[PDB]
Amino acid sequence: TAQYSTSKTPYSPQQDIRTYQPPPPGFTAVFTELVSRHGSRTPTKIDGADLLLQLWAKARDESELTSAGQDFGPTMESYRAAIQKVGLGQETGRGRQELQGMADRMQRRLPELFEKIKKDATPIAVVLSQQTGRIADTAKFFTARLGATDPALAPLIQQPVVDQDLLYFHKTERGKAYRDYLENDQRYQETVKRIKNRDGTREAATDILKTIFTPAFVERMEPSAVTKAAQALYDLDAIAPDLSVEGNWHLDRFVPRHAAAWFASIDDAKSFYKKGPGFEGSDITFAMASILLDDFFKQAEAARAGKLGADLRFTHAEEIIPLAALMQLPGSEKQADPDEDYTYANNPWRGASVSPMAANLQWDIYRNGTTYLVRMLYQEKEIPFKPDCTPFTPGSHYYRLDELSRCFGRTAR
């Protein structure tokens, strides 16, 4: 959906549901549970667009625009206005489409579950990090779609409940040690400084600005303004695909592909240490997510009582990212050696795969007799659990719930 957009990459499901492993013979879906980031959104801040528009107007007045740069003003003005019409930090039309597709595929993959929910009039729970905003709108996209395609589900979907410890832990007391670490840990601070100071950023930044402005205009800027304006333009280019329903502004005209690749690698390195697996031997960035992993188990274990058909949770990237690191999900299984800083060559973690827009984890719970199995989807790709968890049969992506409990340390056996 985009090459260098890191955590702003629009969502796409990573597997076709027709190719999931089929449920083992005799097993039927009895419960499902989800945690999803909000869908594609506008940027949270507009000051970068304004910095660029102010520099553009100055260069225009000085006759210091390139040929392509003549159209930068009108393009950025249009893009800014479309962002403001949606609202900063708000869901876009593409975000709505993303969540609708997720709801469609949930229903298509678990038809027997939704049939059972309707026979038994079983409620569907909705849980949010916050009462209003992009998280609440994301939930409504999903639940409205369930009710549009299957109208009998609409009365069963409960009014949302807010649970900030479960779905907003980086901002609650659960995140106090984490926030203190980011603010005060010297190894962390020195590592971030090394990333910000990597040789190459100045060249990538001047390359970006020279698409719009004559070289002399760029050399006349103070170097701090150069890096700030280039960062702002890279960021606006990176999130433009989120606004695909609202327009196509061809912002790549102004960000050379190699420079976008460079800035993406810097953003991913910063995020790896701030939010992701971080340093070998430390769980400071992700222990706080244990409440959410716990809740996946708690809801699955409660499925034997059958009082809930599904549990749908909506949150931010900063909750999904540490959950993936805590569970050692693919891409999040390699912490960094303190003696070798993260790079794309030495680590598989990427914002685009760990935390795209609408990043989501789902567990489907299947039953035969008294046996309960779990199948896990990550960005809608069916994935194994960490390797000390043993599948139901060799090569299976289905796992006994009691085996998952054991391999995650919740029970002895």
CB atoms closer than 10 angstroms to residue 104 = 15
Peptide-bond breaks in the chain following residues (C–N over 2.5 A): none
Query: CA-CA distance, 409 to 400, in Å (whole number)?
Result: 14
Using only C-alpha atoms, the chain has a radius of gyration, in whole angstroms, of: 23
Burial of 301 (0-12, 13-18, 19+ CB in 10 A): middle
For every residue of 15-33, DSSP letters joined together read: S-GGGSPPPPTT-EEEEEE
Query: CA-CA distance, 354 to 320, in Å (whole number)?
Result: 8
Query: CA-CA distance, 91 to 342, in Å (whole number)?
Result: 32
Q: Are strands 310-315 and 124-128 parallel, antiparallel or unpaired?
A: parallel
* Residues in a beta bridge with 362: 34, 377
Query: CA-CA distance, 139 to 221, in Å (whole number)?
Result: 45
- Which three-class secondary structure string do you get for 71-97? HHHHHHHHHHHHHHHHCCCCECHHHHH
CB atoms closer than 10 angstroms to residue 107 = 16
The sign one gets for the Cα dihedral 174, 176, 179, 181 is: negative
Query: CA-CA distance, 330 to 383, in Å (whole number)?
Result: 8
List, in order, residues 6 or more apart from 215 with CB less than 8 Å away: none
Burial of 17 (0-12, 13-18, 19+ CB in 10 A): middle
List, in order, residues 6 or more apart from 313 with CB less than 8 Å away: 33, 34, 35, 36, 126, 127, 128, 166, 167, 292, 295
Query: CA-CA distance, 72 to 76, in Å (whole number)?
Result: 6
Instruction: Name the method of structure determination.
Output: X-ray
329 and 289 Cβ atoms separated by less than 8 Å: no
Grouping H, G, I as helix, E, B as strand and the rest as coil, residue 228 is helix
Beta strands in 340-408 (DSSP E): 360-368, 371-378, 381-383, 398-400
- In single-letter form, the type of residue at position 7 comes to S
Q: Name the H helices within 240-340.
A: 257-274, 290-302, 317-327
Q: Which domains does the chain have, with CATH numbers?
A: 6-408 (3.40.50.1240)
| 328: nearest Cα among 376, 364, 366, 391 | 376
φ/ψ of 402, rounded to 5, equals -70, -30
Query: CA-CA distance, 325 to 351, in Å (whole number)?
Result: 12
Grouping H, G, I as helix, E, B as strand and the rest as coil, residue 129 is coil
φ/ψ of 197, rounded to 5, equals -105, 10
| 118: nearest Cα among 159, 149, 160, 162 | 149
Length of the chain: 413
